[PDB]
């Protein structure tokens, strides 16, 4: 049971940070939904990397280039 729509999408194309809200996918990656209130871009979150440490970062991207799993 889950009262929240924290889901996992799979990206399905490369993509890059065309915007300044957006961020860089990559086919294969897999990010956590966020923002699903526009079927045109959706917003997932990503991790970051440094000092052995996998940080947390959101981001905008194409809804055309994701594919929901879950």
């Known amino acids: 049971?889950?009262?929240?729509?924290?889901?996992?999408?799979?990206?399905?194309?490369?993509?890059?940070?065309?915007?300044?809200?957006?961020?860089?996918?990559?086919?294969?990656?897999?990010?956590?939904?966020?923002?699903?209130?526009?079927?045109?871009w959706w917003k997932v979150e990503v991790k970051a990397t440094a000092n052995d440490k996998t940080y947390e970062r959101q981001g905008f991207v194409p809804a055309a280039y994701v594919k929901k799993l879950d």
Request: proline letters at 2%; hydrophobic letters at 30%; a negative charge.
């Open 1 to 40: 049971m889950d009262e929240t729509g924290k889901e996992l999408v799979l990206a399905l194309y490369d993509y890059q940070e065309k915007s300044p809200r957006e961020v860089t996918m990559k086919k294969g990656d897999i990010l956590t939904l966020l923002n699903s209130t526009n079927k045109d």
